[PDB]
Ligand SMILES: [Br-]
């Protein structure tokens with residue numbers, strides 16, 4: 001219903017905390033007043049979306065008018081996956097068809113996958129952080145509506161992994177590792193860090209070929225492992241899949257540093 005649609009729109013609006021909406025006058029926009037359509041014209045979708053929301057989120061506006069605008073926003077966005085659309089248009093600054101499709105793809109994927117699989121999808125995206133935060137909001141919204149505990153497990157599990165990537169992206173300690181790499185790309189190093197987290201069953205054999213994957217300059221292969229131990233020791237607990245995952249990873253790097261010292 002329209003009545004519950006407004007509530008879902010406001011519920012989605014509280015998941016995002018767009019300053020765009022708060023900065024907005026509303027008073028002097030002229031939206032008051034009442035039967036409205038597309039008076040906005042030339043105005044970009046993202047801006048009409050935020051402006052409508054500014055009214056929906058209003059502390060003084062009557063619920064009768066909020067309903068009229070709610071239906072209108074539902075026409076602007078597509079009736080299918082409008083929730084995701086709303087979250088996208090508010091969540092992303094420069095939102096283009098490449099982003100809309102990607103976000104939609106990532107979401108349908110989540111609704112049927114490791115932390116690298118997720119990173120590799122969002123890797124080359126403008127405001128990739130933002131694109132990812134959209135899916136997180138969407139999934140956490142859906143979670144409160146799921147019947148199946150199996151769905152609940154899958155859904156919450158993805159939320160953890162997506163937030164994990166968000167934490168990984170938010171860091172800049174790899175500068176010294178990026179320095180010693182041939183390609184000098186942050187993403188190639190970042191990919192490797194995620195692989196070590198993915199490889200819960202970390203083997204001495206696998207870990208030993210780590211500077212070869214990231215193409216670390218010759219001789220500087222031991223130093224790499226020293227920086228790696230330093231890196232994993234520095235990470236927040238949220239980054240690890242298990243409590244013993246830190247302790248085991250650091251043991252392994254230490255075991256490898258010790259093995260290389262004789263050869
Ligand atoms: Br179940």
Ligand SMILES: [Br-]
Nearest residue numbers: 150153154157
């Ligand atoms: Br699962």
